Each structure stands twice: as structure tokens, then as C-alpha cells.
Amino acid sequence: DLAKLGLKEVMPTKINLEGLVGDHAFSMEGVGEGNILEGTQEVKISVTKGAPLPFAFDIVSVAFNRAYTGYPEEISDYFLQSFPEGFTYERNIRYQDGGTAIVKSDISLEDGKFIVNVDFKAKDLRRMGPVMQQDIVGMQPSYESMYTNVTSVIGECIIAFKLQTGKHFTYHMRTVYKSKKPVETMPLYHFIQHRLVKTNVDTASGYVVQHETAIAAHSTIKKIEGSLP
Amino acid sequence: DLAKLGLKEVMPTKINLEGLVGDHAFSMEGVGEGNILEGTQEVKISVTKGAPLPFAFDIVSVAFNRAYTGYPEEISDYFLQSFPEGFTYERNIRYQDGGTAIVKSDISLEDGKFIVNVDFKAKDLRRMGPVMQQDIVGMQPSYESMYTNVTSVIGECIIAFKLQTGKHFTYHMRTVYKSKKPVETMPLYHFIQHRLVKTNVDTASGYVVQHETAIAAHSTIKKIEGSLP
């Protein structure tokens, strides 16, 4: 199964991010590993150029691979089917205060390692908002709706940053994932539950270790017999 | 418990909707009942004025009461706490094609019956889109993030209409729910899983019976020990 696609159960990954938030350009690197059957991943991230960042780090957490998703056999796995070649995605983010972000990423398979190249561009961020004031402690778990659009897969989600005061600051994320080569079966409508946490925050070392768990599933509410749709 | 709030397990409900979509004004009525502990409801809806509607009915499904939500004891129930007085909500909807909708509703408790008065106003709907062309078969299940904002509760969700061709058409919904009187405890961040189905579609009678199941819960992914937030 995974050997036909050129993958193993525990894949290492290297991710290179080029970012531009407002007028601040920066570059970030991330090295890590994950399990593609259980849908877990853990990456250590550092800032190579542009330090220190004048915004909250957590806005680029979703930029640092849906191959790390736990898919049941009853739901077709688009991302694992996309390999050995990999897949790309274009992702639009609207924050609740009007700010926007655009994330374009390519995920390749090279020497049994997931090589991710991602470009992150944010604009119209409020100077007095929690992102620029860095009042975000982390992300809350989320549910991303996934459905088929001809040959692509669309995922829509509402991400919520928890704030120091206990309040929340949300954004709407819409991603178009495209396999680089044709895929046998396109998936039906389902959800991917995410939980992205920060397992280590070392400000003296300039490293942030984040762990994401992603589990694909249908709704746990049974559809009423003879009902539409 | 429920008797202190003036409620019973199975509450009947009457809902009156005044709507304006584009230049088309209309009025709709709905009579039904639900269980507030299990989080189920079923209402029969008809069009009193403005028939026939030139748009898909399913856009007003979310307008036809979070009191019908199954809440575990470990998650505080804002909506049931809001009673006997009831609660209001203001709801903003952005469709994926640029159209918008505004829903203002009041939910009162009168004679052991949920009396809902809702105003629905939609604009900028595409003439060649699935809403005006009526290509929608129904809603898919969803997950609505719920969190506290001082004294109000904010819920954010992505609703997906299934289309006749099998494709999907989504919209982003953000609702501010406000209890009419103070509430003892405000809830923590959680989700409400919805499944709104159509149990009966009788076009000859002009009636549509819809059933919603709503279950409140935390994330089913265990938070990693010692991680942030």
C-alpha cells in the first residue's frame, strides 16, 4: 500500500517557508516527522531571516501537509493517493478583523522525506489587534469540511486562536488541494478534526515545536432514515 | 432543573419568519416540537406570503433555536440558562459567491411553547448560482465552534449545501447569541455538531418538514500533556 506510493508509516519532513506580513519579510525553517496512518506530526520551527517577528507566530502554524491525516478505509484518501508525486494547495484566510492571508504550498516526496515549500503572505492586519500585539497563546482544535470539486479537494474551516485574556480570535480558511497527477477515487463529503498544539516553546533558543493531530471521519450523528440529502 | 427555567423535556414551537431576498419579500410559518435534552427538533414549514419562492428554500433552514441542543453536564448550557426569558441572536452569512444574509431572531418562552420571531434578509445572490437556480438538495452536517465573548456566545460555522450534480456550495456563518437576562456561568470553547435533514418534502402541499440534531461536545482528540494552549 504505502510502498506502492513510495511512503512509510513514519515520514520525516523538511519545510521551508517564505513569508511577507505587511511590510515585514521573513523566512522560516521546520524539521520534523509524523505518522501518516495515525494522522500525527511534530515539527520544530525556527526563524532563519527576519527575526524578531512583529506578529504572532501562530498565524503560520497552518503553513507548517495533509498527508499526515488519519483516514479510515471507508473514506478515500486523496492526499496519500496523490503520491509519490505529491500535491499542492492554495489557501485563502480571512481574519475576523478584515485582515487576509494567502498560502501557496507544494508538498513533494524526495528520498523518503516530505519536502514542503510554502509561501505565506498576509496583509491588512490591525496594529492594535491580537496578532500584531501578540496576545495569542495558541490554536484551539477545529473541524475542516472536506469535499470533492471535480479533480480537486476543497477544505473549509474556522480556526480560533485563544487569547491571553481567555477570549478568542477566529479566521475563516478555505483551501484548494490539487494532486499533481490523477487520482483513482475522489472522496465524499467528510470532516478532518484537527488539534494543533505547541509541545515546546523555548524563546531563548528561538525554536517552537508544534504537534498536529488530524483525524478524518464522517459525521457522528446518524442520518435520519429516508431524509434528504 | 428544567422546571425552574419554565421548560419541559419536549417543547413545542411556533416560528414566524419575515424575509426579503433581493427584491422578493415573503413570509413563512413553522410549527413543530423538539427535545432540549437530546438536542433534536422537527418543524413543518410553509410559505404564507410570497409564494412561489424564486430561490432555494434551504437558505432559510438555519433561520427556522439553540435551546434544542444536547449539552453534557461538563459543558455549561448558555441557551437553557437564558430562560424563562429567552434569548436573541444576530447572524451574518457570507456565501462563497459573494452573496450575504443577515438573520435577526428572538426566541421567547410563552405558555410552555418556544415562540420564535425571525427576520431574514439576503442580497447580492448570483442569478446563475445554485441558490437562485435551485440546484440545492439539502444541507450537510456541520460543526459550529462556540465560545464566550464577555456576556454573549459566539458561534462560527461553515455550512455546505449539497447540489444535484454532487458538488457542494458553502457559506460562512457567524452568530452572536445574547441571553436576555444574566447567566450564571459562561461556557468554555466547544463545538455543536449539527445535522439538519429534510424528513418530508411535499411540493403539492407546500410543506417542508425539517429535523435538526444538535449535540454539544469538546474535541474528541486528547490534548497533548503539557502543551499549549
Tab-separated table of C-alpha atoms in Angstrom:
chain	number	residue	atom	x	y	z
A	1	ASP	CA	0.000	0.000	0.000
A	2	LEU	CA	2.298	2.751	1.257
A	3	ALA	CA	5.281	1.156	-0.502
A	4	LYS	CA	3.482	1.450	-3.848
A	5	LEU	CA	3.160	5.195	-3.192
A	6	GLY	CA	6.778	5.434	-2.017
A	7	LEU	CA	5.857	6.159	1.607
A	8	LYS	CA	6.392	4.567	5.014
A	9	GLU	CA	4.422	4.795	8.250
A	10	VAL	CA	6.678	7.398	9.918
A	11	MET	CA	7.823	10.040	7.431
A	12	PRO	CA	10.354	12.773	8.201
A	13	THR	CA	9.767	16.207	6.743
A	14	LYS	CA	11.591	19.447	5.984
A	15	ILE	CA	9.545	22.602	5.377
A	16	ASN	CA	10.823	25.934	4.043
A	17	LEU	CA	8.563	28.980	4.411
A	18	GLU	CA	8.971	32.369	2.745
A	19	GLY	CA	6.700	34.946	4.340
A	20	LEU	CA	5.683	38.573	3.947
A	21	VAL	CA	3.376	40.059	6.595
A	22	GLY	CA	2.609	43.705	5.961
A	23	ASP	CA	5.992	45.197	5.095
A	24	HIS	CA	7.980	42.615	7.098
A	25	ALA	CA	9.632	39.865	5.052
A	26	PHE	CA	10.945	36.741	6.747
A	27	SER	CA	11.996	33.131	6.226
A	28	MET	CA	11.365	30.113	8.440
A	29	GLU	CA	12.521	26.501	8.565
A	30	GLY	CA	10.941	23.421	10.086
A	31	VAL	CA	12.252	19.890	10.615
A	32	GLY	CA	10.141	17.081	11.978
A	33	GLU	CA	8.363	13.795	11.478
A	34	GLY	CA	4.919	12.255	11.587
A	35	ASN	CA	2.718	9.198	11.226
A	36	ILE	CA	0.511	9.214	8.117
A	37	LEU	CA	-1.716	6.335	9.266
A	38	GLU	CA	-2.476	7.707	12.741
A	39	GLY	CA	-2.502	11.272	11.405
A	40	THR	CA	0.067	12.825	13.729
A	41	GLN	CA	3.013	15.123	13.134
A	42	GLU	CA	5.552	17.103	15.147
A	43	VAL	CA	7.874	19.759	13.704
A	44	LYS	CA	10.475	22.085	15.227
A	45	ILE	CA	10.320	25.549	13.648
A	46	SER	CA	12.849	28.389	13.689
A	47	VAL	CA	13.182	31.791	12.026
A	48	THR	CA	16.146	31.968	9.653
A	49	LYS	CA	15.689	35.546	8.411
A	50	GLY	CA	13.536	38.411	9.631
A	51	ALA	CA	13.840	37.799	13.373
A	52	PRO	CA	12.335	39.041	15.531
A	53	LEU	CA	8.824	38.710	14.113
A	54	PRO	CA	6.492	41.648	14.915
A	55	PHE	CA	3.404	39.387	14.773
A	56	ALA	CA	2.088	36.276	16.490
A	57	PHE	CA	3.817	33.089	15.359
A	58	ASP	CA	0.585	31.066	15.399
A	59	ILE	CA	-0.602	32.621	12.125
A	60	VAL	CA	1.923	30.453	10.235
A	61	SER	CA	1.143	27.239	12.148
A	62	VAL	CA	-1.229	26.042	9.416
A	63	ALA	CA	1.512	26.733	6.863
A	64	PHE	CA	3.933	24.342	8.583
A	65	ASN	CA	0.758	18.732	4.965
A	66	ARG	CA	-2.496	16.783	4.788
A	67	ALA	CA	-0.541	13.574	4.170
A	68	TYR	CA	-0.371	13.483	7.990
A	69	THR	CA	-4.050	12.607	8.353
A	70	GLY	CA	-5.646	9.508	9.847
A	71	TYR	CA	-8.073	8.223	7.223
A	72	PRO	CA	-10.431	5.276	7.747
A	73	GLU	CA	-10.731	2.764	4.932
A	74	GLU	CA	-14.339	3.851	4.262
A	75	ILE	CA	-13.147	7.360	3.280
A	76	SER	CA	-10.895	7.733	0.247
A	77	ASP	CA	-7.526	9.347	0.995
A	78	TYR	CA	-6.866	11.996	-1.654
A	79	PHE	CA	-3.530	13.160	-0.247
A	80	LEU	CA	-1.908	9.737	0.107
A	81	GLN	CA	-3.242	8.816	-3.343
A	82	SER	CA	-1.524	11.926	-4.735
A	83	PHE	CA	1.929	10.445	-4.042
A	84	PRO	CA	4.754	9.625	-5.000
A	85	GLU	CA	4.493	12.927	-6.887
A	86	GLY	CA	2.939	14.949	-4.064
A	87	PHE	CA	0.340	17.681	-4.064
A	88	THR	CA	-0.050	21.447	-3.954
A	89	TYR	CA	-2.533	23.733	-2.272
A	90	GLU	CA	-3.749	27.320	-2.463
A	91	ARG	CA	-5.233	28.622	0.776
A	92	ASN	CA	-7.132	31.848	1.472
A	93	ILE	CA	-7.523	33.119	5.035
A	94	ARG	CA	-9.775	35.937	6.237
A	95	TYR	CA	-9.335	37.050	9.830
A	96	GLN	CA	-12.363	38.277	11.759
A	97	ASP	CA	-10.973	41.847	11.759
A	98	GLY	CA	-10.613	42.154	7.973
A	99	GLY	CA	-7.012	41.019	7.588
A	100	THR	CA	-6.228	38.473	4.897
A	101	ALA	CA	-3.589	35.866	4.124
A	102	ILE	CA	-2.645	33.771	1.090
A	103	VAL	CA	-0.726	30.497	1.455
A	104	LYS	CA	0.652	28.649	-1.578
A	105	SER	CA	2.459	25.415	-0.846
A	106	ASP	CA	3.963	22.438	-2.658
A	107	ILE	CA	4.489	19.064	-0.954
A	108	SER	CA	6.994	16.761	-2.679
A	109	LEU	CA	8.353	13.302	-1.871
A	110	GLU	CA	12.159	13.232	-2.094
A	111	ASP	CA	14.304	10.389	-0.701
A	112	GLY	CA	11.525	9.142	1.564
A	113	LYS	CA	11.118	12.616	3.083
A	114	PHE	CA	8.277	15.127	2.770
A	115	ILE	CA	9.777	18.316	1.314
A	116	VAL	CA	7.375	21.249	1.728
A	117	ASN	CA	7.901	24.664	0.129
A	118	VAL	CA	5.367	27.231	1.314
A	119	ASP	CA	4.822	30.935	0.627
A	120	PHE	CA	2.819	32.942	3.169
A	121	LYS	CA	1.614	36.497	2.512
A	122	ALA	CA	-0.541	38.454	4.965
A	123	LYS	CA	-1.946	41.969	4.714
A	124	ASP	CA	-4.384	44.409	6.339
A	125	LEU	CA	-3.524	43.187	9.844
A	126	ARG	CA	-4.748	45.560	12.550
A	127	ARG	CA	-1.930	47.191	14.511
A	128	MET	CA	-3.944	47.045	17.758
A	129	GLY	CA	-5.238	43.515	17.140
A	130	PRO	CA	-4.142	40.331	18.918
A	131	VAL	CA	-1.920	39.241	16.013
A	132	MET	CA	0.305	42.328	15.912
A	133	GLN	CA	0.115	42.808	19.692
A	134	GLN	CA	0.933	39.086	20.156
A	135	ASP	CA	-1.882	38.208	22.558
A	136	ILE	CA	-2.344	34.679	21.148
A	137	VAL	CA	-1.453	31.673	23.290
A	138	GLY	CA	-2.288	29.033	20.675
A	139	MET	CA	-4.842	27.405	18.418
A	140	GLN	CA	-7.953	25.551	19.504
A	141	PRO	CA	-8.978	22.260	17.864
A	142	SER	CA	-11.012	22.584	14.688
A	143	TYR	CA	-13.147	20.700	12.168
A	144	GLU	CA	-12.354	21.158	8.466
A	145	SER	CA	-15.078	20.216	5.985
A	146	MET	CA	-13.631	18.325	3.006
A	147	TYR	CA	-15.417	17.744	-0.292
A	148	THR	CA	-14.648	16.994	-3.928
A	149	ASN	CA	-14.598	19.653	-6.671
A	150	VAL	CA	-14.063	17.698	-9.913
A	151	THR	CA	-10.373	16.803	-9.567
A	152	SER	CA	-9.511	18.981	-6.546
A	153	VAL	CA	-10.407	18.725	-2.865
A	154	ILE	CA	-11.779	21.755	-1.020
A	155	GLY	CA	-11.404	22.156	2.733
A	156	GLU	CA	-13.150	24.900	4.713
A	157	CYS	CA	-12.576	25.607	8.394
A	158	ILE	CA	-12.887	28.197	11.155
A	159	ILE	CA	-9.688	28.433	13.212
A	160	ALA	CA	-9.840	30.004	16.676
A	161	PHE	CA	-6.826	31.499	18.435
A	162	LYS	CA	-7.134	31.513	22.209
A	163	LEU	CA	-6.058	34.816	23.745
A	164	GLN	CA	-4.258	35.600	26.993
A	165	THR	CA	-7.457	37.088	28.443
A	166	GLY	CA	-9.405	33.915	27.619
A	167	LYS	CA	-11.227	35.415	24.635
A	168	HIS	CA	-10.925	34.005	21.116
A	169	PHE	CA	-9.995	35.459	17.722
A	170	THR	CA	-11.094	33.479	14.681
A	171	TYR	CA	-10.423	33.295	10.965
A	172	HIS	CA	-12.030	31.531	8.011
A	173	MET	CA	-9.748	29.281	5.952
A	174	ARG	CA	-10.552	27.879	2.501
A	175	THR	CA	-8.005	25.585	0.852
A	176	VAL	CA	-7.950	24.025	-2.617
A	177	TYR	CA	-5.741	20.918	-2.612
A	178	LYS	CA	-4.653	19.590	-6.012
A	179	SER	CA	-2.906	16.295	-6.676
A	180	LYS	CA	-0.080	16.658	-9.181
A	181	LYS	CA	-1.230	13.515	-11.041
A	182	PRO	CA	-4.672	11.914	-11.457
A	183	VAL	CA	-6.257	10.114	-8.509
A	184	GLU	CA	-8.234	6.869	-8.677
A	185	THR	CA	-11.203	7.775	-6.448
A	186	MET	CA	-12.316	11.200	-5.230
A	187	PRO	CA	-13.550	11.349	-1.620
A	188	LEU	CA	-17.064	12.096	-0.445
A	189	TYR	CA	-18.041	14.894	1.932
A	190	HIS	CA	-16.417	14.395	5.335
A	191	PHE	CA	-14.534	16.222	8.096
A	192	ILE	CA	-10.947	16.344	9.292
A	193	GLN	CA	-10.714	17.082	13.001
A	194	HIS	CA	-7.505	18.943	13.850
A	195	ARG	CA	-5.745	19.621	17.129
A	196	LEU	CA	-2.575	21.693	16.677
A	197	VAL	CA	-0.727	22.286	19.950
A	198	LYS	CA	2.672	23.676	20.937
A	199	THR	CA	4.610	20.959	22.761
A	200	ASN	CA	7.665	23.155	23.415
A	201	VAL	CA	8.152	26.932	23.472
A	202	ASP	CA	11.796	27.920	24.041
A	203	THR	CA	12.188	31.648	23.441
A	204	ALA	CA	15.869	31.632	24.430
A	205	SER	CA	16.627	29.115	21.668
A	206	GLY	CA	14.320	30.580	19.025
A	207	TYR	CA	12.566	27.239	18.498
A	208	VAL	CA	8.877	26.314	18.612
A	209	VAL	CA	7.841	22.651	18.454
A	210	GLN	CA	4.270	22.092	17.272
A	211	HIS	CA	2.304	18.840	17.088
A	212	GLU	CA	-0.798	18.369	14.938
A	213	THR	CA	-3.276	15.502	15.166
A	214	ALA	CA	-5.633	15.165	12.191
A	215	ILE	CA	-8.355	12.501	12.035
A	216	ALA	CA	-10.708	12.150	9.069
A	217	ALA	CA	-14.256	11.000	9.789
A	218	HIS	CA	-17.871	11.338	8.756
A	219	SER	CA	-20.495	12.931	10.989
A	220	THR	CA	-21.115	11.024	14.222
A	221	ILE	CA	-24.831	11.920	14.028
A	222	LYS	CA	-26.752	9.194	12.216
A	223	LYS	CA	-28.608	10.450	9.147
A	224	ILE	CA	-32.355	10.050	9.643
A	225	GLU	CA	-33.773	7.234	7.532
A	226	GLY	CA	-35.415	8.427	4.333
A	227	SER	CA	-34.311	12.048	4.753
A	228	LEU	CA	-32.675	14.437	2.303
A	229	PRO	CA	-29.983	14.958	1.211
B	1	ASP	CA	-33.828	21.843	36.692
B	2	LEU	CA	-35.948	22.452	33.599
B	3	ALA	CA	-38.969	23.316	35.758
B	4	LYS	CA	-37.005	26.137	37.402
B	5	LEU	CA	-36.409	27.571	33.916
B	6	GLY	CA	-40.043	27.007	32.918
B	7	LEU	CA	-39.229	24.278	30.389
B	8	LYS	CA	-40.043	20.605	29.859
B	9	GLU	CA	-38.207	17.850	28.003
B	10	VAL	CA	-40.316	18.031	24.815
B	11	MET	CA	-41.129	21.631	23.891
B	12	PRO	CA	-43.461	22.658	21.067
B	13	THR	CA	-42.532	25.678	18.998
B	14	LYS	CA	-44.049	28.203	16.607
B	15	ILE	CA	-41.728	30.240	14.377
B	16	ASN	CA	-42.669	33.254	12.244
B	17	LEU	CA	-40.187	34.395	9.588
B	18	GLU	CA	-40.244	37.647	7.626
B	19	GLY	CA	-37.843	37.506	4.699
B	20	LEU	CA	-36.517	39.699	1.912
B	21	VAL	CA	-34.217	38.086	-0.667
B	22	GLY	CA	-33.128	40.513	-3.351
B	23	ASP	CA	-36.336	42.317	-4.285
B	24	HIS	CA	-38.615	39.411	-3.289
B	25	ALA	CA	-40.393	39.787	0.052
B	26	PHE	CA	-42.030	36.794	1.701
B	27	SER	CA	-43.348	35.379	4.967
B	28	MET	CA	-43.065	31.848	6.331
B	29	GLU	CA	-44.516	29.899	9.245
B	30	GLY	CA	-43.261	26.839	11.079
B	31	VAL	CA	-44.878	24.606	13.699
B	32	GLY	CA	-43.066	21.782	15.414
B	33	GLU	CA	-41.542	20.293	18.524
B	34	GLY	CA	-38.243	19.093	19.912
B	35	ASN	CA	-36.285	17.576	22.772
B	36	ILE	CA	-33.947	20.015	24.539
B	37	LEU	CA	-32.016	17.323	26.434
B	38	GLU	CA	-31.302	15.080	23.435
B	39	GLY	CA	-30.926	18.113	21.166
B	40	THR	CA	-33.460	17.204	18.490
B	41	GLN	CA	-36.180	19.178	16.751
B	42	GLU	CA	-38.636	18.758	13.886
B	43	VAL	CA	-40.667	21.585	12.333
B	44	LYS	CA	-43.135	21.767	9.440
B	45	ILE	CA	-42.629	24.940	7.392
B	46	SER	CA	-44.917	26.636	4.872
B	47	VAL	CA	-44.896	29.886	2.900
B	48	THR	CA	-47.728	32.215	3.904
B	49	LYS	CA	-46.926	35.142	1.592
B	50	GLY	CA	-44.603	35.480	-1.378
B	51	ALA	CA	-45.122	32.034	-2.902
B	52	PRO	CA	-43.618	30.765	-5.046
B	53	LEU	CA	-40.086	31.492	-3.845
B	54	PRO	CA	-37.561	32.207	-6.642
B	55	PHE	CA	-34.664	30.860	-4.529
B	56	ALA	CA	-33.683	27.640	-2.787
B	57	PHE	CA	-35.615	27.020	0.424
B	58	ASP	CA	-32.564	25.637	2.245
B	59	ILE	CA	-31.109	29.125	2.765
B	60	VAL	CA	-33.716	29.754	5.495
B	61	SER	CA	-33.287	26.359	7.193
B	62	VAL	CA	-30.901	27.817	9.783
B	63	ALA	CA	-33.459	30.555	10.462
B	64	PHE	CA	-36.142	28.024	11.431
B	65	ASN	CA	-33.276	27.792	18.242
B	66	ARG	CA	-30.188	26.629	20.119
B	67	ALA	CA	-32.368	25.584	23.061
B	68	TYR	CA	-32.715	22.342	21.063
B	69	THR	CA	-29.140	21.267	21.766
B	70	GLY	CA	-27.870	18.218	23.631
B	71	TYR	CA	-25.441	19.534	26.238
B	72	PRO	CA	-23.357	17.320	28.534
B	73	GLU	CA	-23.137	18.311	32.180
B	74	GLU	CA	-19.426	19.162	31.790
B	75	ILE	CA	-20.284	21.968	29.322
B	76	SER	CA	-22.361	24.898	30.550
B	77	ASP	CA	-25.617	25.412	28.640
B	78	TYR	CA	-25.940	29.113	27.819
B	79	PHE	CA	-29.229	28.827	25.932
B	80	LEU	CA	-31.139	26.825	28.542
B	81	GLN	CA	-29.732	29.119	31.242
B	82	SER	CA	-31.127	32.098	29.307
B	83	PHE	CA	-34.717	31.002	30.023
B	84	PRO	CA	-37.554	31.596	31.104
B	85	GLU	CA	-36.940	34.932	29.363
B	86	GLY	CA	-35.354	33.521	26.207
B	87	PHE	CA	-32.544	34.776	24.029
B	88	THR	CA	-31.853	36.673	20.824
B	89	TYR	CA	-29.270	36.286	18.105
B	90	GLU	CA	-27.758	38.272	15.251
B	91	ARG	CA	-26.318	36.131	12.470
B	92	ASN	CA	-24.195	37.122	9.469
B	93	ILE	CA	-23.861	34.781	6.491
B	94	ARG	CA	-21.443	35.101	3.574
B	95	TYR	CA	-21.950	32.718	0.676
B	96	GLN	CA	-18.921	31.509	-1.263
B	97	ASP	CA	-20.014	33.540	-4.323
B	98	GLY	CA	-20.179	36.913	-2.548
B	99	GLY	CA	-23.839	36.920	-1.547
B	100	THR	CA	-24.708	37.877	2.013
B	101	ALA	CA	-27.514	37.342	4.502
B	102	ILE	CA	-28.490	38.842	7.861
B	103	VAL	CA	-30.684	36.934	10.327
B	104	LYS	CA	-32.070	38.602	13.459
B	105	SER	CA	-34.167	36.398	15.699
B	106	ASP	CA	-35.826	36.444	19.112
B	107	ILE	CA	-36.701	33.245	20.999
B	108	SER	CA	-39.306	33.661	23.756
B	109	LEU	CA	-40.977	31.237	26.162
B	110	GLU	CA	-44.762	31.697	26.172
B	111	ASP	CA	-47.192	29.175	27.710
B	112	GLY	CA	-44.627	26.378	27.655
B	113	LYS	CA	-44.006	26.934	23.934
B	114	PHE	CA	-40.959	28.313	22.122
B	115	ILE	CA	-42.128	31.370	20.164
B	116	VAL	CA	-39.515	32.401	17.585
B	117	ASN	CA	-39.689	35.620	15.559
B	118	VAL	CA	-37.010	35.796	12.875
B	119	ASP	CA	-36.135	38.317	10.161
B	120	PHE	CA	-34.090	37.097	7.189
B	121	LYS	CA	-32.571	39.459	4.613
B	122	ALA	CA	-30.375	38.274	1.738
B	123	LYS	CA	-28.679	40.257	-1.015
B	124	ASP	CA	-26.124	40.003	-3.834
B	125	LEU	CA	-27.236	36.474	-4.744
B	126	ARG	CA	-25.944	35.376	-8.147
B	127	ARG	CA	-28.705	34.835	-10.702
B	128	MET	CA	-26.856	31.865	-12.247
B	129	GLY	CA	-25.828	30.383	-8.891
B	130	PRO	CA	-27.258	27.271	-7.229
B	131	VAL	CA	-29.430	29.306	-4.840
B	132	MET	CA	-31.389	31.229	-7.477
B	133	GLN	CA	-31.329	28.298	-9.918
B	134	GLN	CA	-32.468	25.976	-7.080
B	135	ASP	CA	-29.844	23.259	-7.517
B	136	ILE	CA	-29.609	22.511	-3.769
B	137	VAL	CA	-30.836	19.170	-2.444
B	138	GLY	CA	-30.104	19.881	1.225
B	139	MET	CA	-27.593	20.695	3.927
B	140	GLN	CA	-24.695	18.533	5.035
B	141	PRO	CA	-23.869	18.060	8.732
B	142	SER	CA	-21.676	20.736	10.269
B	143	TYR	CA	-19.592	21.666	13.310
B	144	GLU	CA	-20.180	25.085	14.894
B	145	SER	CA	-17.433	26.441	17.149
B	146	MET	CA	-18.896	28.046	20.285
B	147	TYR	CA	-17.018	30.357	22.637
B	148	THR	CA	-17.683	33.071	25.199
B	149	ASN	CA	-17.394	36.805	24.449
B	150	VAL	CA	-17.942	38.522	27.821
B	151	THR	CA	-21.704	38.052	28.222
B	152	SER	CA	-22.518	36.754	24.719
B	153	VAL	CA	-21.811	33.453	22.982
B	154	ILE	CA	-20.281	33.418	19.500
B	155	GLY	CA	-20.788	30.513	17.116
B	156	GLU	CA	-18.914	30.181	13.818
B	157	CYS	CA	-19.593	27.516	11.206
B	158	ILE	CA	-19.194	26.563	7.551
B	159	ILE	CA	-22.452	25.222	6.098
B	160	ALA	CA	-22.327	23.145	2.910
B	161	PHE	CA	-25.284	22.716	0.568
B	162	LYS	CA	-25.144	19.530	-1.471
B	163	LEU	CA	-26.015	20.101	-5.124
B	164	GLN	CA	-27.888	17.940	-7.621
B	165	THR	CA	-24.647	17.261	-9.512
B	166	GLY	CA	-22.928	16.091	-6.315
B	167	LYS	CA	-20.860	19.253	-5.878
B	168	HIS	CA	-21.119	21.476	-2.804
B	169	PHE	CA	-21.775	25.182	-2.229
B	170	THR	CA	-20.706	26.583	1.128
B	171	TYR	CA	-21.224	29.659	3.263
B	172	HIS	CA	-19.636	31.062	6.415
B	173	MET	CA	-22.000	31.770	9.316
B	174	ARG	CA	-21.159	33.849	12.398
B	175	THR	CA	-23.810	34.210	15.103
B	176	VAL	CA	-23.836	36.290	18.288
B	177	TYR	CA	-26.289	34.798	20.795
B	178	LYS	CA	-27.330	37.029	23.703
B	179	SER	CA	-29.308	35.960	26.750
B	180	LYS	CA	-31.981	38.489	27.676
B	181	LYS	CA	-31.010	38.270	31.373
B	182	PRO	CA	-27.694	37.479	33.096
B	183	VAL	CA	-26.395	33.908	33.083
B	184	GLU	CA	-24.683	32.145	35.986
B	185	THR	CA	-21.753	30.519	34.151
B	186	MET	CA	-20.419	31.244	30.666
B	187	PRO	CA	-19.339	28.192	28.642
B	188	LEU	CA	-15.832	27.319	27.535
B	189	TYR	CA	-14.737	26.746	23.943
B	190	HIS	CA	-16.546	23.753	22.448
B	191	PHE	CA	-18.395	22.568	19.337
B	192	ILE	CA	-22.010	21.922	18.427
B	193	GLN	CA	-22.347	19.223	15.790
B	194	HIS	CA	-25.428	19.770	13.624
B	195	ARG	CA	-27.271	17.525	11.201
B	196	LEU	CA	-30.239	19.275	9.566
B	197	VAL	CA	-32.176	16.995	7.214
B	198	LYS	CA	-35.491	17.190	5.361
B	199	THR	CA	-37.723	14.358	6.569
B	200	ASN	CA	-40.615	15.237	4.235
B	201	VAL	CA	-40.795	17.256	1.011
B	202	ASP	CA	-44.367	17.605	-0.289
B	203	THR	CA	-44.427	20.143	-3.113
B	204	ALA	CA	-48.138	19.603	-3.798
B	205	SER	CA	-48.975	20.633	-0.224
B	206	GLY	CA	-46.440	23.452	0.079
B	207	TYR	CA	-44.943	21.958	3.248
B	208	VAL	CA	-41.350	21.064	4.127
B	209	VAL	CA	-40.611	19.146	7.335
B	210	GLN	CA	-37.047	19.547	8.604
B	211	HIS	CA	-35.347	17.796	11.522
B	212	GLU	CA	-32.201	19.095	13.219
B	213	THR	CA	-29.978	17.163	15.613
B	214	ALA	CA	-27.525	19.288	17.611
B	215	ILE	CA	-25.026	17.767	20.053
B	216	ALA	CA	-22.580	19.877	22.058
B	217	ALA	CA	-19.173	18.366	22.792
B	218	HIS	CA	-15.500	19.121	23.229
B	219	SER	CA	-12.857	17.886	20.799
B	220	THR	CA	-12.539	14.097	20.679
B	221	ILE	CA	-8.757	14.438	20.197
B	222	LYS	CA	-6.986	14.339	23.552
B	223	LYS	CA	-4.899	17.439	24.241
B	224	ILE	CA	-1.223	16.503	24.475
B	225	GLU	CA	0.053	16.648	28.046
B	226	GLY	CA	1.928	19.841	28.848
B	227	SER	CA	1.105	21.522	25.531
B	228	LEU	CA	-0.220	24.996	24.779
B	229	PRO	CA	-2.809	26.412	24.812
